[PDB]
Design a protein around this ligand. Structure first.
Ligand SMILES: CC(C)Cc1ccc(S(=O)(=O)Nc2cc3c(cc2N2CCOCC2)n(C)c(=O)c(=O)n3C)cc1
Length: 112
């Protein structure tokens, strides 16, 4: 646990993104057992737990790779689900609120 300012920032940012997911519907992988066709359409599933595991294994080297995985959580959800669903509407809201979190966090990352 030799921390860096960058990794601390990513940890804080991930917590701020998860706070926007008040129903915790993006906290864990979409359960493939409950949805057997998910991988037929979604090439790379993503969720906040997987992102936390990547972070704790020190696999995010820059802000772009971190943001790319967040964007997968949203875009996977919009792709798989019909527009008139709780999941789709939640992904739209997360894109909006999470985008603001990422804008502020990238500004802090830029001055590192
Ligand atoms: C009206 C609804 C909300 C009723 C309902 C339907 C299915 C399921 S579920 O048991 O299949 N779990 C599930 C599938 C998801 C999903 C997220 C969850 N969870 C993850 C853990 O918190 C609980 C919800 N998300 C984010 C997707 O984007 C997506 O495509 N699917 C398939 C649960 C609840």
């Amino acid at each position: 646990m030799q921390l860096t300012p960058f990794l601390i920032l990513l940890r804080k940012t991930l917590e701020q993104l998860q706070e926007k997911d008040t129903g915790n519907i993006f906290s864990e992988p979409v359960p493939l057992s409950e949805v057997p066709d998910y991988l037929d359409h979604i090439k790379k599933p993503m969720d906040f737990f997987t992102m936390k595991q990547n972070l704790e294994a020190y696999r995010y080297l820059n802000f772009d790779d971190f943001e790319e995985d967040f964007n997968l959580i949203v875009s996977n959800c919009l792709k798989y689900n019909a527009k008139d669903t709780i999941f789709y509407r939640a992904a739209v809201r997360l894109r909006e609120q999470g985008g603001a979190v990422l804008r502020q966090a990238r500004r802090q990352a830029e001055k590192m």
